[PDB]
Each structure stands twice: as structure tokens, then as C-alpha cells.
């Protein structure tokens, strides 16, 4: 929740065969929890040796192509699958449906540690950029740069050092390389007040969500209502439905050192706003905070406006 000292920009990042579905009720862009977990894994790989911290992300989505098809005059979509290898016999028995997507994302990470205190500026960015090219960001591999016009522009932009007009010039210089993207930010307060708006009959949050992202057509007693923005439903963290357990208690855990919980997704609201329409870039960083007393394990973006 701490404001960072620096916004280390990860560049144009083509990632292929991602997870499109990412939630039991959405199918579009992958979850932002994947991005916060990706930054925490990158921290566990490079930041302990670099003596820094890495907390937030800026999810911009320069381009996005799903592996879908619109089957033969229908208003829906279906998912392109992949043929799996055979069983002990030649059955092709099980076909579980999971989607894929190719997205060119570019993250901006909030640094906390000894960035300029004990280390240089370009070398830390070079190390983290050549470290993030040997891992996967959403369920699919991070494709490297082999095409022409070799960028490598890991801008390790300092934020708290400099005058105010120079700082605003640095923000509007970093926003120049976010040129065709679209930042994703949570709008929990917007969903709350939109729930209080239509609380006349029954104020269910899952009904205010499922009647806002659509196009609600309603004539004159002949129009559609004015689109307030690019509102999407996103997974906004998990919610436990079973108490805490011991490490070696629950059968077939991923590891027997950390406790287990049986959880369930929470569906929040999100917007794809242009990066020019934010004051500072550090306003749109995704952090995941947890309250282990109750069951809420929520990722969100504080200071989103």
C-alpha cells in the first residue's frame, strides 16, 4: 500500500497461449491476480539478490487476440482447443475446455528497496528485463524480442527524486510509450453506488454486476442508455468457504509447509481507461492485500482516481 520510489517500466511484452478464461464467469483478459502473482514470483527470483521490492503492476494491453470462433451464424463464441495425447489406448477420452489468448502487455512495477541507494539505475532494469524473459506471466510463455527495431527500453524511472514540473514531464514522457494501450483499474466504489442506485427492489451485487456491463436497451414509453465507460467484470480476489488448515493435514496439497484454504472467486468491476486520463502512473498499480482473519484475499488498485 506504500507509494513506490520508482516505476520500473517493463516494455512491450508479447505473451502467447495465455489463459483467456481466468474466472468462472469471465472469458476476456486474464485475471489481474495473475499479474500480481507474476510480480511476486519475479520478486522471489530477482529482487532478493537485487535488494529491492516489487509490488504493483500497470496492465495496459497494447493488443489482444483470443483463440475463439463465432460458429455458423450465432451470437456467441466458442473456444479453440488443442488436441491432447492419447491414453493407454487410443481413446481421446477427456477433452477439458480451456481458452487461450495472445496479448501484448506492458507492465510498470513499483519498486521499494535500495534501487538508487546502493545500485545503479540502468543495470537493475537490464537485469530484471533479462530475468522476466525466462518465465510465464498468465499461464503462457513470454515471447522475447527477435524482430527488428530492437527496443530494450526498460525505463527505470525515478519518481520521488526531482522537481514537480520535471516529475510531471517524466510522467508524460513515460505515458508516451503507453501509446495504444489501455490501463485496467478497479471501480469498486462505482459498483457500490450503482448498487445503491437500483436498490429499489433487491440490492444484490451479482445482479448490479450482471446488469451494468451489458447494453440495457429500453425505449421511450427508442434508445439505449448512455455508455458511462468501458466497464468489464473482473475477478477481484478469492473468498474462503472453509476454515484454515494445518500444512500436513489436508490430503494432496501443493506443498506441506503452508496452510490450505478452500476459496471462491469474487467478481469486481474494472475499466480500461487511456493512460493519458490518469494524473500519475503510480495511481494505477495493482496490489493484493489479504485479511486472514476473515476469508477475503482481495487484489485491487488503491488510489485509482
Amino acid at each position: 500500500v506504500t507509494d513506490p520510489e520508482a516505476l520500473l517500466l517493463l516494455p512491450r511484452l508479447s505473451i502467447q497461449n495465455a489463459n483467456a478464461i481466468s474466472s468462472p464467469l469471465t472469458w476476456g483478459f486474464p485475471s489481474p491476480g495473475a499479474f500480481t502473482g507474476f510480480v511476486h514470483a519475479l520478486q522471489r527470483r530477482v529482487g532478493i539478490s537485487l535488494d529491492i521490492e516489487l509490488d504493483g503492476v500497470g496492465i495496459v494491453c497494447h493488443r489482444f487476440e483470443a483463440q475463439i470462433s463465432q460458429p455458423a451464424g450465432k451470437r456467441t463464441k466458442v473456444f479453440n482447443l488443442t488436441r491432447n495425447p492419447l491414453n493407454r489406448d487410443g481413446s481421446t477420452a477427456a477433452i477439458v475446455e480451456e481458452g487461450r489468448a495472445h496479448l501484448e502487455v506492458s507492465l510498470l512495477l513499483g519498486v521499494h528497496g535500495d534501487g538508487l541507494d546502493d545500485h545503479p539505475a540502468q543495470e537493475i532494469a537490464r537485469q530484471v528485463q533479462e530475468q522476466a524473459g525466462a518465465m510465464r506471466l498468465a499461464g503462457g510463455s513470454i515471447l522475447p524480442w527477435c524482430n527488428e527495431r530492437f527496443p530494450a527500453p526498460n525505463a527505470e524511472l525515478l519518481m520521488l527524486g526531482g522537481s514537480d514540473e520535471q516529475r510531471r514531464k517524466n510522467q508524460r514522457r513515460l505515458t508516451r510509450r503507453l501509446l495504444p494501450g489501455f490501463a485496467l483499474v478497479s471501480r469498486e466504489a462505482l459498483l457500490q453506488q450503482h448498487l445503491e442506485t437500483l436498490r429499489t427492489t433487491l440490492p444484490e451485487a451479482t445482479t448490479l454486476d450482471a446488469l451494468l456491463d451489458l447494453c440495457r436497451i429500453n425505449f421511450e414509453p427508442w434508445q439505449v442508455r448512455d455508455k458511462p465507460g468501458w466497464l468489464v467484470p473482473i475477478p477481484a480476489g478469492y473468498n474462503a468457504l472453509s476454515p484454515l488448515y494445518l500444512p500436513g493435514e489436508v490430503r494432496n496439497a501443493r506443498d506441506r509447509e503452508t496452510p490450505l484454504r478452500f476459496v471462491e472467486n469474487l467478481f469486481g468491476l474494472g475499466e480500461w481507461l487511456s493512460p493519458h486520463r490518469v494524473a500519475a502512473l503510480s495511481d494505477l498499480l495493482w496490489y493484493h492485500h489479504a485479511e486472514p482473519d476473515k476469508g477475503l484475499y482481495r487484489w485491487s488498485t488503491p488510489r485509482f482516481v
Partner: peptide
């Protein structure tokens, strides 16, 4: 604001490729 942002996005998408 959405019209200005769409114009800026089209201007950014035109002169990139």
C-alpha cells in the same frame, strides 16, 4: 472526452506500424 481519447488512440495506432 471519449471522442478525444478515441482520436488520440487512432492517431497512436496509425503511426506505429
Amino acid at each position: 472526452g471519449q471522442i478525444c481519447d478515441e482520436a488520440l488512440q487512432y492517431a497512436a495506432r496509425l503511426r506505429e506500424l
